[PDB]
Structure formats: structure tokens, C-alpha cells
């Protein structure tokens, strides 16, 4: 109610809308380098 707002607000999206306000999928990749065993490595490398 008055001066009592839900902390969240919804979005509204329609195919007619402009590109700027169209929904987008976002992915963020972060890399960790600690004094710890490495778990992420590059792809295959091989020669005949």
C-alpha cells in the first residue's frame, strides 16, 4: 500500500517492443586461481 512497496518489481515484454527493452539472456564466467588443485583445463591436443 501507500509507503509499503514490494521489494521486487516485474518485467513486461512483448514481441512488438523495441530492441533496447527486449529481454536478454546473460551469462557471466569468472575464473579462480588459488593455492589449490586445478580443476579446469583446456581442450584436447594430439598429433598422429
Amino acid at each position, epitope marked *: 500500500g501507500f509507503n509499503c512497496y514490494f521489494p521486487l*518489481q516485474s518485467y*513486461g515484454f*512483448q514481441p*512488438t*517492443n*523495441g530492441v533496447g*527493452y527486449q529481454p536478454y539472456r546473460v551469462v557471466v564466467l569468472s575464473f579462480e586461481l588459488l593455492h589449490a588443485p586445478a580443476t579446469v583445463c583446456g581442450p584436447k591436443k594430439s598429433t598422429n
Partner: antibody
Amino acid sequence: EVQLVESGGGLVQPGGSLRLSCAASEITVSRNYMSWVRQAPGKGLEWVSVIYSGGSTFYADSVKGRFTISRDNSRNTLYLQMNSLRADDTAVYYCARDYGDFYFDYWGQGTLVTVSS
Amino acid sequence: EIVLTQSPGTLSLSPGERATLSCRASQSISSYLAWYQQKPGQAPRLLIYGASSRATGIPDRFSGSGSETDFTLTISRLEPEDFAVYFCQQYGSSPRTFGQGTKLEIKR
């Protein structure tokens, strides 16, 4: 109910400085988005700046590094300082609160600002 | 920066009828405009949430209409308390802007 009371403004020669202030009757200011806008006659309103509830700020491009904004949560009062006041900026300036994406809901009585040699 | 155009230049009509305030923007948006009232020499007052959501302190006579780029404001059964100027501002992003205003006149 909720009221905004301002003061200040006025006339100073070009190149001067001016600080403004406004207090709120019931809304605490601390937990609210607060903004400043100005009206020049025959030209209309204009955005100036605003403060987010997280304490962050932003301003128009034409005034970056020139127009300042501050708050005093202890007193539910809004503080604005202006430096490097230039020509044709003479106008009435207002304090305003939002809900949602900058819906200026409640308004003060407006404060005149004037610049001329 | 996105620029609005309020239309017509002035509004002259008798009370009790319907009002029609049209507005146009430079760049197409989706339901990112609003309306602001001002009786002269007073505090501007917020009218309409989004394109068609009305504030609680505002009677039912008002109605707003919006599109991609054309947006129009409608009020019915005009009354003396309504004589004022009318303004459009963008609650989208640019950062935000406004319109040039339009004045309503009550005719006897």
C-alpha cells in the same frame, strides 16, 4: 500527510555558487529515491539528478562534475550544492520522490534560482 | 537523447466533455511514458502510472493511451478543477526526458 519543504535558491552573478536544501514532513528521505528537477519558463521542465536508495547518484551529461547532491538521514532533509552557475539556467527547481522507475509522486513548493550579472 | 512532442499546441473546450492529449516521441518505446499536471504557480502533480494505470488520488475521469511511439491522454466529463497545463515525461531510459506541455482551457 507527506510533504516536502524546501528553501534557498536565488540570484548570484555568473560564476557563483549556491547550495539548496529541502526537508520532508513524513517520508524519511533515507529509504526513498529523491530527485531534483528545474523549470524554465516557456521551455519546460528538465531532469537534473536523483539519488537512489542505496546512496548512489547520477546526473545529466551537461552538468557532470558540476552539480552535487547529498543527504542527511538524521533530519530527513535533502541537500544540493551548485557551483559554476551559468547563463539561462535561471529557473525554479523542485525536489521529488519516486516509486517504481522514477514516478515523481510528491512535490515540494519549488524554489527559484536566478543567475545574471 | 529522446525528444517528445505534445499535441495540440493548446486545448480549448467546454466542461463536461472528453479531453484528448496526444504525444509523440523520437524513438519507439513500450509503455514508458507518464503524465504530469500543473495548475499555474503550483506544484506539478503526478497523473498516470505507465500508459494506463491511474494513481489513487486521481478520480476516474482520466485515462491514458500509449503505443510504440504514439501516446494519447484522455479525460472525460471536464470540470473547472481541470483547467491547467499538461506535461509528458519518459520513465524509460535515455536518461529520462520530458515533453513541451499543453494547456487545457474550460469554455463557457
